[PDB]
């Protein structure tokens, strides 16, 4: 059978918590009043939810209303409990209220308003300094939720809101987040295909907070190399092939051997044989202004097959890549 694995940090935080902290199924939802909110304009959407900017008429303040589709609505108690537990933490979106539509019985989560800068403009115009600055802000949110015994499990640009004028960042969409319990085998059908870690792709269920660090590494590689997404897999099997074409197959087989992971019968025919590529292969005239030896060393320490070898969020914050960032 597969070799078990534990996180190397924050391993027992949930064991020392009262059951109410992590037993989200026992949580009783105190529903607020939907009539407190006037929906003004659509901000965005997804396969799980529709997002609107609204006014809370009881205080005349702007809020964000996230209407959950049935898929997201099914695990709403987990999302609520995680949001309530992390509320007040650094760069964590603040849940303000929980409402239910009496006509469709659909629930909605109400959040603090973020004056988001257009996502395309941010991807296109962020400077070398800004990338480092915002990466450090994400690491604050990740180290906080990991220290609180939660993995986000869906880290990507679409789940980060930036108010570029106020240099304010919020990690959002906690719908796929889970409590980390050592030895627990989780569902690998988490995150988004481009950001899925090798543990998910090889069906290694005993994963941990380190999955978020792989996804962070995918975000970073896309940003600095100007390649959206960095690992462009057609499906979950091809996703591992795209990763193997960069990290190489030798370190992949060393990874599976270490954890005694069993792959699909055609593994040799699908994966083939690939050398580990030098990061400089991805450096071109249009991206050289975002690349440095520090950025490459940092990326190298996030994008590792072995989930246990990746930098933790707190180690990542000590990296020389952030020495230029004003703290
Ligand atoms: Cl039913 C409803 C009415 C309202 C109140 N008049 C908003 C007018 C536009 C607000 C809201 Cl937020 C909702 C709502 C919608 C979907 C899910 C939960 C609540
Ligand atoms: Cl972290 C980040 C976030 C962004 C901006 N995302 C917008 C996400 C979003 N989802 C929404 C859902 C409903 C409504 C509005 C929404 N806005 C861009 C960029 Cl380029 C980065 C970035 C990437 C790498 C390094 C530094 C920054
Ligand atoms: Cl047949 C099988 C499939 C599985 C299912 N995970 C597939 C992991 C995987 N992802 C890939 C991506 C690209 C390429 C190959 C991939 N392989 C598990 C197991 Cl345990 C077995 C198994 C194997 C031998 C003996 C007993 C069971």
Fold of 23-113: Phosphorylase Kinase; domain 1 (3.30.200)
What's 166-194 look like in SS3?
CCEEEECCCCCCEECCCCCCCCCCCCCHH
Distance of CA 177 to the CA centre of its chain: 9
- Among protein residues, the one with the nearest Cα to ligand 2's atom 14 is 44
E strand or H helix that includes residue 158: none
Locate all alpha helices (DSSP H) within the chain, ordered by sequence. 19-22, 70-73, 76-86, 119-125, 128-147, 198-201, 210-225, 236-247, 249-258, 267-271, 293-302, 313-317
Whether 154 is a known active-site residue: answer yes
CA 51 vs CA 25, 78, 224, 235: distances in Å: 25, 19, 29, 28
The reply to whether ligand 3 has any atom less than 6 angstroms from the CB of 252 is no
Say yes or no: CB of residue 250 within 6 Å of ligand 3: no
Q: Where are the domains of the chain?
A: 5-22+114-327, 23-113
Nearest-angstrom CA–CA distance, 265 and 110: 47
Considering only CA atoms, which residue is closest to atom 19 of ligand 1?
A: 101
The ligand minimizing its distance to the Cα of 132 is 2
Return contacts of 128-133, CB within 8 angstroms, 24+ apart.
Answer: 128/289, 128/290, 128/292, 129/324, 129/325, 131/220, 131/223, 131/224, 131/290, 132/321, 132/322, 132/324, 132/325, 133/167, 133/325
Q: Is the CB of 201 under 6 A from ligand 3?
A: yes
The alpha carbon dihedral of 146, 150, 153, 157 has a sign of negative
Instruction: State the resolution, in angstroms.
Output: 1.9
Q: Which is the closest atom of ligand 2 to the Cα of 117? A: 5
Cα–Cα distance measured from residue 163 to residue 55, given in angstroms and rounded to the nearest whole number = 19
Q: Kindly give the distance from the C-alpha atom of residue 173 to the centroid of ligand 1, in angstroms, as a whole number.
A: 20
Name the burial class of residue 285, with classes exposed (0-12), middle (13-18) and buried (19+) by CB atoms within 10 angstroms of its CB: exposed
For residue 255, give the ligand nearest its CA.
3
Architecture in CATH of 5-22+114-327: Orthogonal Bundle (1.10)
CA distance 108 to 63: 12
Report phi then psi at 249, rounded to 5.
Answer: -80, -25
Catalytic residue among 97, 154, 173, 212: 154
Cα-Cα end-to-end distance for the chain? 46
Angle at 245 between CA 239 and CA 248, to 5 degrees: 115
Question: How far is the C-alpha of 35 from the C-alpha of 264, rounded, in Å?
Answer: 53
């Amino acid at each position: 059978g597969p070799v078990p694995s534990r996180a190397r940090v924050y391993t027992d935080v949930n064991t020392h918590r009262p059951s109410e902290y992590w037993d989200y199924e026992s949580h009783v939802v105190e529903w607020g009043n939907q009539d407190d909110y006037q929906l003004v304009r659509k901000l965005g959407r997804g396969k799980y939810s529709e997002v609107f900017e609204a006014i809370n008429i009881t205080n005349n303040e702007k809020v964000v209303v996230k209407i959950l589709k049935p898929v997201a609505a099914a695990k709403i108690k987990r999302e609520i409990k995680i949001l309530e537990n992390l509320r007040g933490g650094p760069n964590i979106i603040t849940l303000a209220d929980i409402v239910k539509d009496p006509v469709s019985r659909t629930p909605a989560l109400v959040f603090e308003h973020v004056n988001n800068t257009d996502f395309k403009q941010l991807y296109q115009t962020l400077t070398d300094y800004d990338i480092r600055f915002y990466m450090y802000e994400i690491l604050k949110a990740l180290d906080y939720c990991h220290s609180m015994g939660i993995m986000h499990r869906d880290v990507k640009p679409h789940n980060v809101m930036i108010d570029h004028e106020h240099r304010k960042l919020r990690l959002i969409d906690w719908g796929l987040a889970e409590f980390y319990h050592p030895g627990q085998e989780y569902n690998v059908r988490v995150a988004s295909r481009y950001f899925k870690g090798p543990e998910l792709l090889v069906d290694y269920q005993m994963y941990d907070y380190s999955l978020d660090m792989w996804s962070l590494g995918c975000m970073l590689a896309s940003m600095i190399f100007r390649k959206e997404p960095f690992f462009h897999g057609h499906d979950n099997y091809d996703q591992l092939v795209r990763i193997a074409k960069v990290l190489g197959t030798e370190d992949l087989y060393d990874y599976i051997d270490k954890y005694n992971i069993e792959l699909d019968p055609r593994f040799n025919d699908i994966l083939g044989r690939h050398s580990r590529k030098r990061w400089e292969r991805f450096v071109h005239s249009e991206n050289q202004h975002l690349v440095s030896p520090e950025a490459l060393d940092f990326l190298d320490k996030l994008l590792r097959y072995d989930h246990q070898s990746r930098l933790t969020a707190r180690e990542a914050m000590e990296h020389p890549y952030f020495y230029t960032v004003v703290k």
